[PDB]
Chain length 291, copies 6
């Protein structure tokens, strides 16, 4: 990367300026998962990018998933799952494992990675300082709503305490578990939780790291890939997308309808995708705006 003339290095940096101005002092919530979480190079770059935002006076908040790591731990422990439709039932036992994996393993890795750059990252769940609560959610399988245990949606968010935490200079790394109104901790889908945090904190952007180039309208025709789409158009496209894309699209819809100026589906397999998406006009992602 040294053969590149220095007067073009300048123009790349200078071209970051309008986005540095837009985001200065703003909250950016980032859903982190997928291959950006499993490969060491993409991992280290993601943590560096969070340090970058933070050393620009931007306020990143990281929400992470970890579905496959939970499954692997359950298999190691010999915990036999029950399944309704495609969903595992989250017994009290499965939740203890889920919480222990997400908060005590997956979150820890990211906190330490980020903290290689400074005392920034702080790991938390909804349990800590009552930062957010959960409401038990049902799923509908083959047409009927049904209970799958201690799984929920974000209910209320302690917006004040959370913003104090970021104004203090910290990068929260959120593991999506929180108590319901009776103190019973539930596990929350990380995609939906990121949308709820973005809306509650008045975030400027929601970023959804996924393992795809971007949203295709008629997958897999290559030319169906789009750069920007409004909520109304995307809401009506929702029942046609592949299974994996629906949670990310439902998140983007709830966020931007909830007032978040834009939500982005970006390719987590690209090194420094966050830097590319926020400070460059040449991202592969797809931007969701209201309309």
């Amino acid at each position: 990367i040294e053969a590149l003339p220095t007067h073009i290095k300048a123009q790349v940096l200078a071209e970051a300026l309008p986005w540095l101005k837009q985001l200065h002092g703003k909250v950016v919530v980032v859903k982190y998962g997928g291959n950006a979480m499993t490969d060491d190079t993409l991992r280290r770059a993601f943590a560096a990018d969070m340090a970058f935002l933070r050393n620009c006076g931007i306020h990143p908040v990281v929400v992470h998933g970890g579905g496959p790591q939970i499954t692997a731990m359950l298999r190691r422990l010999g915990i036999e799952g029950d399944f309704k439709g495609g969903f595992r039932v989250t017994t009290p036992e499965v939740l203890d494992v889920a919480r222990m994996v997400l908060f005590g393993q997956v979150g820890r890795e990211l906190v330490n990675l980020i903290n290689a750059h400074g005392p920034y990252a702080v790991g938390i769940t909804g349990e800590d300082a009552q930062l957010f609560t959960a409401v038990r959610r049902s799923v509908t399988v083959d047409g009927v709503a049904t209970d799958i245990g201690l799984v929920g949606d974000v209910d209320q968010v302690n917006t004040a305490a959370m913003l104090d935490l970021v104004a203090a200079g910290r990068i929260p790394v959120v593991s999506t578990l929180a108590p319901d109104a009776d103190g019973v901790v539930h596990n929350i889908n990380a995609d939906t939780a990121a949308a709820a945090v973005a809306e509650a904190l008045g975030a400027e952007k929601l970023l959804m790291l996924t393992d795809i180039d971007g949203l295709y309208t008629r997958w897999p025709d290559r030319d169906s890939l789009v750069s920007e789409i409004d909520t109304g158009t995307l809401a009506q496209l929702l029942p046609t997308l592949e299974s994996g894309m629906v949670p990310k699209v439902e998140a983007c819809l709830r966020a931007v309808i909830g007032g978040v100026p834009s939500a982005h589906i970006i390719d987590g397999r690209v090194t420094h995708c966050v830097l590319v998406e926020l400070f460059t006009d040449a991202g592969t992602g797809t931007k969701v705006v209201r309309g």
Copy 2:
């Protein structure tokens, strides 16, 4: 507890006043472990007592252990241990389990218990916001110092950031793991870590919840139980005590020699032992002062 005349209920409360004055606005570090951690009634009372201190303008900091829960998880996972002397070698694998159990299971229970009373508890390790670091420690077995893996002592403490956290109204619940100067996370003995936190934070008292009435000089003669002892006298008694008492005594010595006005060995099998030890003159504990 209602047949008791109300004019004696008054005198019990009024008799708390000199200790409310002594501790108002002060840090109190509490090592929590033993039966006070395993029985639901003692557990719930301990969390209530932390809420009590906090609703008195006292600043509790909780450090917790969890040795037996780590062992049980290692056995569930089929992780064969290596043992030098009586010590398990903490491989990278054992540490991941230890961190996951201590921070993602044991700490979570206490945070949620305390938080039943309000948004007080916040769980953390040395990894979060670089709150404290670890230095790898050796043990000496049968006369020779020897390496037992990723085990250490508290190195430096981010005293400023930690006191900000408690001035903000929070009750930190500390899981004793922290990175060394290279970012490699170690597990720290909870007793020694509590002493280091008490000294670093300028605590007024260190409380060590143990499963014994108090320090016996010639166990098990019943009349060898003492109420108060100075560091010099106790340092010379150290090589005679039962195996389980040495870590708690070494902690009390390091703390009070380190400037902490008093350290207390109190019986964690007594419901509300904290309330008894701090606000009553009739505790069964033993108080350590300098001299």
Copy 3:
């Protein structure tokens, strides 16, 4: 008080917790008078209790009377009183004496008693920093309203400056005198003044120390004593009570109708009645709520 087992001392303290939570950070206004003011043991306990609240992060405000001490000083000075009905006419001369006794004698004793525990108490009237004003009040005697000199009701309260004073850590000890809109100082009934201060400061509780077990509906049938009563029921009972109880009941009505969550008539002859009433479920007082 030492023969009492220590595990019951614990339960008494632990049972204070729900009230410590309710009152933490809250204003509690206390009308202090009667035998709680004349006997040294009850006096010293009252001052200790104010120190207690304050060392719990509660914000006590004390309003005191002193009718009999004024009378005794007037007799010592040979000031002949004029009387309309049962009321002394407060000439400019009587007011100077009243102010001098209440502020320069009675208030001083309480400030010094409280201050034996720390730099807490601060004595004041409405004159100081224009903290509250008075409006001249009439009385009605044998059916007709009539002027009895420089006697009034609290008019406006400098709520902001007063709360600054308590947020600063101080325990105001208020002598009920204040200027009217022309700067002419009036003496205010201490019971009514306490109700006005409680309402103006947004107090959580008003406590009225009196020399009786509590409110009797049909004095003196012993079983007419009640524990709790709403404002509507008590307002209609008002014209039947003994002469001495009316000012305390009118105060409780004005306070709780004014928004104060509860007002309490408690027995000032009981040592530590404040501690008993606030932190115990076994008080002899009577609680007034709205309805």
Copy 4:
């Protein structure tokens, strides 16, 4: 005062500027007593002048005496005095009267006068918020030191709390009574107390209102009146002055030797003497500087 040309009114005001700059943001302690306290016109002007300083961003602190009012109250109460030399013995009874007169009568008048201009004045003694303490003082009569009861000198001053009070915009009006280290309240000579407050608060000036034109070296030769004198020269003149001047001179010596840049003996019989002394070059007072 209207026949005076307006271009000379201008020059008088403009000539205040160098002293407005010198005193802006500074503490000025003022001993108030004498005829400036007994005549209504001089009284009202003094209170106006305190409002003036305060509406210039200057921080006045007022210390007042009241010897003759105490005597008159003792005579009204039939309290027979005991006298050693020329000193009344301050029994516990005499002190209660002294405190009640100074704090509950004399201080009240000044607070209300000042407060006619705004919410400025606040009355206090050493008892309030433990603002200052007293140490019992002896007197020497006919050559021998001797006890005259509960009379003392200022011991320690809560400098921090006092300056908070003035930074908050208040004009403390101090009645010179304070507890000793055992809580026993003593009465303090107002002149000496003013010097101790000036030194403790880092005052820029001490003003001593007296009933004389200024310090005469050889009273009563008219030409012995001086405008300025250093501490060394005045210390050696001390044993020759008239009885009434010694307390004021001892105060000026202790203050300016204690670090106070200048102390002034000014004529309290002149209307607005404070305004004249501080903002004009034509004062009749005498200025004391170190040397």
Copy 5:
């Protein structure tokens, strides 16, 4: 000024008190121009008066003109003017000169004069920190509106940033130039700009230094001079006044109709006219109030 008795010096100072109270903590905007700007004695007195206000806890803001100095610089540079009616057309060249003269010459003199008394003055235009913007204004000549170049009126004012600047202790000295919404800097009439600043900052008074005794209704009958007039009466007098008085009267109208409690036309040829107008009842000015 020394033959004047000192008890009349006192009364002049004491008579400032009601105006010191009215203006304490308030913004006073002062249009400075005319002979008060050209003569060294009047200049130095004006700067002293600004120091005076500031050493009274008053917040002066100075707006200055400089028409004749611009003309003289244009003549020195050989810049030929174009004139429509009586107005010079402000080409880009004339503006550069105007800005350079007003900000780099005329403002500098006043900043240094004021700063002889302390670090008070700070020079600024609308360009600095975007403190205010301009909107291009037309003039009407011989009946028709017409463009005269880069001349405008104050558009929006950064009220927050400006008050921060004065709360910080500074005396802004404003040169009336500001960018329009496209960043193109315009020159603003100093009289109108002073009115807009007074209204935007919530000033207590606007002072307009002019070279006349005050407003005459039927110039030049001597007895037509008035002391006070309401906006309605003065608005209807507007089309009759001499050419030079209209900008000052239009300013006073816009200010006081805009909410400014009073605007004053005062004689800038009088030494210390500001001190005379604000702190004395004997000013020659004319006061404008709403009605």
Copy 6:
């Protein structure tokens, strides 16, 4: 700049991170002059770069020169210069012009350019709020020290007030003129003034924009260009450099010897030289460190 692959745009941005961390929250003083000031493209890029730093939480302070613009204005005004050696004598007349040009023309252009990006820039001299003073400097011509009028060096700097100004979010744009201890304004060489400001403000870096690639040791051998040099080595090279380089080298020496971690001589003819020098490893400048 769009044909460049986006995964290399990423690496350029990511490579800024170590310098974003080093400079976050730090003062950077920038001497701005030369062709970076005369060409519109380089001008606009410089202002953008100042906005960039500021939108990264870096604190730029800009010091500007303007020698040639002063000369041109003097020629336009027909002001005949006097010359001793190669130096113009700065008469009171030349200074008024210099101040008017630097502060009222050259500084204004940069403030408005920067402010196109936000309310950042604020123009000032040493005169404003007494921000810094000047001491008259002599020059030595043909071997003898000699007076050349109102020219000086920075004397003292109001470090506190200046850092308040930058902590408030502002970008000071400094015109190098300041009063001496008698209030007489002098003109200061902009290069030396930048070094004095960097040292006084505890800057992390001093940047000197010049019209050369960097420091050559044996100009003009191309291979004598160096990347980094210590103060000791450069001090001994000083008497050999071309005339134009000495002021920039003397500045770098005074700054880094004064404690500034590094000073940089960078090529002001390169677009975005600031971005290149601070956030890239490929700058053409020369870095000066202590040794």
